[PDB]
């Protein structure tokens, strides 16, 4: 069988973390303070073992995800080759037991050495804090400063327990020399250094390895031997590397910056400009309230919702964009299927009180619709000819007919502005030819009060009736080839029966040109001109 | 080098210097010991140590070893700052070498730290996915979205960490070949495998690789609408897909969402994710201007079409090929009517033979003829076209004019 | 707040939580001195306490300032990790309090380096100037500038630093009515005492120098070449200002240049730096769109061109204003000639009068009406222009149809 | 200026303001023993001192030099933060010294700390090249593709760097005036080769 991510697996993965954050503290007290060990603690210490023997013949079973494909392998051959390769020879070694070997082999210090290979273990416990790392649930500054303090806690009670180690070498008869029998605090002797208590003599090695490893150096207690100098020159080496890690990791997130320290750092450059030109005294009130709002008003700016697949984004666009789009009376009587093409491609913009979108004779390449604030229209002594507001839509007029824009539009209040680009805007148009003469022919419309229009009425009346002239040839062909289904399509939606092309041709003509009676009485029931007239004279009856 | 690691290449490099600077300290503090007489060695730092029960009483002829282990520890001591005290200068002399060496050593102490700094300065693979996240989180939590949407966000971008999908951030440095021989490594035996590209040439095939884009989807999920206009074009490589009471099973290797790429009918099935799929997507403006392009390739793409309900859809197809041949001529002709000199140019070079008549029969030259334009009529001698053509009505393009 | 300083108020708080600690250290530490019993008052850290030929035999009833000052003594030593060792932990109770207190000033103590980190990341002005300077210097001595001109770009590199000319990098964020009143608190002095800008009005004049530019040339340049055409208009504000043997020496608010710019005549003298001057330059593109909108105040500004060689000049410049005029249709005509119906758009909102004619006369409408423009046509109609005008032929634009 | 190092002047002036806080403050410290009589100079900071077998009972005229390097050598060694403890505060006076001159080192030492970092984390023009070709490097390795493919693109980003000069160049704040001429002596020679400018008159080349 196999057990990729069973949730019982995820179980035993937690369990076995226990298992490991003891077996990683408690190798460096078995093997500095403890010669064998005693008969209680000898059901922990097997008991350990055997746990992790189970994860080693387990480890097999469980399957691994492609680093290629994201496959998940789940070959039995993949399985065994890949932890054979990189860590089953060390962690094998581990779980051999390394106390009972050294008793029935006499008493060799030297086979105890190998009992350090179970320090290794400790990497499940930096694992875990890389796999709640990823989690958001927690805070991620919390969890790099408790991680930073376990890689020191660690680090230090190891160093702790091989100081004291160093001591028990040297006999009795010669522990003048340690660094721990010829100690004296106060009055305290420390003279016999054995038979003390195992409490008062491991925390005086670790208050030694403290106050070394923070660099701190009082000097009460200190290496005597060469053997002891030796190890305290490799221990205070590896803590310069280690420290100045611990510095970079803190100098990290605080250069990384805060939000208030961007607005402050922004005004400060302002200010002595001022400053050096010595300008106003009102003036500074204006612009560093100005700031005040531009800090505040920026939510969707640099947005990075743009990392999210399209059908994603989809949904979320018409869950908000789209009850502000139906309402615009630019789009009355659409389509449900093309409202719905428009407002996956809107964009979010925010514009502060003050500012100006679109200047007078530029060129126009956004469609703008208002959501939110105000707008002010300036033209020309400035006059103010209009005054925008929420649910309108601006820039439409200058879009169709190919002219500059006539008045420039300012800010007077914190609006949110929907934009769509003018390249996009057309392709939709092409596409639903029977709701895009409708948004032209309701713009037509809005010529009672508007001035702008009146005077660009001309050019709206070529476009719809060139729009129109290109219904009827779509109209003519649709009974060319005998196809009903898309003249229904094609007559409903405003198209007219009694439409004439170019060159004099009726879709009764065309009816009867391939002799299909099915279209003919269609368009008879539809109060068409039987007598229709071309140009070339040609009636429908003569033609048939 | 690249061979060798750019962490590791610099780590070493630190260490050698301090290492190199202690042992160079320590001997030079052990010389300025000789220099004293031995009458006098209780001045020194060394002819007056005594840690334990051992004195140095003689300071000279003990051994070259533990003579020098303790001058090494006084240098290593003071180099990081600890300062354990057990060994200090003692005379003059000793004094002001202590003061140049200790003072040299907080230059080269806050040069550790700086390249130590600058390593983690720049931020990991996770570090940026919460910086990333809280970003999202903030705007999406803003504009208060319903907490079933919430998930689908959330897990979607847990989703693009770990597999990695993007993995695309430095690749413009690429000069395109050298991209075109990596896009077709991964994703040309998914290509190849696909039912409606059967028979298509090698050369085309490769055109589109290049362009493809990978990415991933959860179960649950929902990629087209039922009802909805589509414009990417889908192929599945991996996992299983379901299209909506189901209908049919995405089987790996197909392809999806090519209905409406051509024939602009809309969707008529919803596609809902079943299991962890790879998907590898392709956007409207390159499927479109290769196919202009290579209206060789399209014509052996339309054939297998049909080949690739089904029996229902390979007749309704060819109802749509034959009326967008037709609906070419409407425009051209019109364009032509209108004397659009720009509007007439995009239909030739990338679209049809003006030569071909609409379904009453109008050349492009009628319509020009007729109207009285002039300069117009420079442009369709240029291709040739034939100005006796016929219409159905006994009239030729110069009666027209 | 802005009114205090923002460095000064971070470096308070740095020494504020390092002042705090302390102070709650050095109390809670001789605490653990008080717990144990008078009788066995050697095993603490101050019973013991021997500095020099004081001996703390009681550690009570000595005094609370020269007992607190002692603690307080022990605690900073340990927070800044400088560890003189002369009072240290004795106690197992006190052994624990220590390993606690001094992993704790760890993490508070790269806080305090991190914070000071980031105020020095921010570069300082002189910073990016070195950084400039050497791109500039590494890439003007690759292609291998000769030296006469290398001390040019150098000199006039340090004089925009000195000075400040640009001071807008950080400027945008303006939103133009506040930087509107900027611009005329420091230009409008200099450009009202300009004589050519005599008597124009004041709502106009605004309108410009919100886009003027500000930059210093050290003496001995040169701006203008002679037989170059210009197109920058600058005011002179400040220094003084040597016009090529001298003919014209450029005195203070005046202002030069604008022969080029509306005559397009080119340049017919070189400029010469003869001190520290101030200038305010003026891109051509802005100016020709000011004027376009504003017909009546270039009216205004062209008479008085002329007031403002100079008599040579003044009737040299009468000649190319009548001409300008007649250009304007000239091209107007050649548009409608042509049916160019966009090309028309730009000369009827930014030109003259079309119901004007050329030197021999030859109202757009008589030729569009002969060429049998029909679209064009309806254009004129809404124009309003005259049907009627005639000629010098006798001829109507209806006839010519 | 432009002629002198800029590292070297940082690091110069670092060493200078590092060394005359350590000069006054040794001067001040030896004052405080001073303070007191010469019947009680037991208690200072020196009177009490005792190296090797050397004395310093008297603390007066013993030299001006040694006496004077002993100070500064207590002065450098507490600035460091190493504190060796043979020289140490005694009294109660220079105690309250010692803590107001240890806290100030502090804050010096934060900001050496500070400079040195922000010189490095600047740039160095090769760590960016490191940087993004590891980048890359991941990417390829993380899908296997390939063998001889990896020495073209490796062998590509070589060329990128080295053909690299004028790219991101800042001749932008240069007035117009200086920008117009450099640009004939350096463009012009290779417009008036091209075939397409047979026959043009000077003026018009020179726009």
Redesign the interface.
Known sequence: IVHPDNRWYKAWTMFILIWALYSSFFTPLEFGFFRGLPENLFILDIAGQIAFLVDIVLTFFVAYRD??????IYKRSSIALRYLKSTFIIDLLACMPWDIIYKAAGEKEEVRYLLLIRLYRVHRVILFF?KM??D?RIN?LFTR?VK??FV?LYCTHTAACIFYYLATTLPASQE???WI??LK????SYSKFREIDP??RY??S??FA???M???????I?????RE??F??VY??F???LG????????????K?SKTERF????????R?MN??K??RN?RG???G??RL?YESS??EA???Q??????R???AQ??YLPYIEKVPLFRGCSS?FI??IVIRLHEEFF?????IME??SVVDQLYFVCHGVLEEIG??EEIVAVLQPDHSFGEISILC???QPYTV??AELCRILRLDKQSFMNILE?FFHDGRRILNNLLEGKESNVRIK?LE?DITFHIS?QE??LA??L??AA??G?LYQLKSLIRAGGDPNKTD??G?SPLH?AASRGYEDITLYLIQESVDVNIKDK?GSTPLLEA
């Open positions: 680093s290629r494909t994201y496959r998940m890389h790392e990823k958001i991620y400063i930073l303090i020191e003048g020399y340690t029998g010829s605090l106060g009055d305290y409490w008062t925390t005086t670790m208050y403290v106050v070394t923070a660099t701190v150096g009082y000097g009460d200190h290496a005597v031997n060469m100098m030796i305290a020159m205070i080496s803590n310069m590397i100045a890690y611990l510095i970079g990791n803190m100098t990290a997130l605080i250069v910056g402050r750092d922004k005004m400060a450059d302002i200010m400009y050096r030109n300008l106003g003036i204006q612009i560093t100005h700031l531009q939510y969707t947005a990075v919702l990392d999210i697949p399209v059908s994603i989809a949904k979320i869950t908000l299927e719905n093409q502060l009180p003050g500012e100006v007078q004779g020309i002594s190919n002219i500059p300012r800010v596409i005077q001309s060139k002239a290109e040839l779509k003519n062909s060319f080839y196809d170019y060159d041709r065309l070339l």
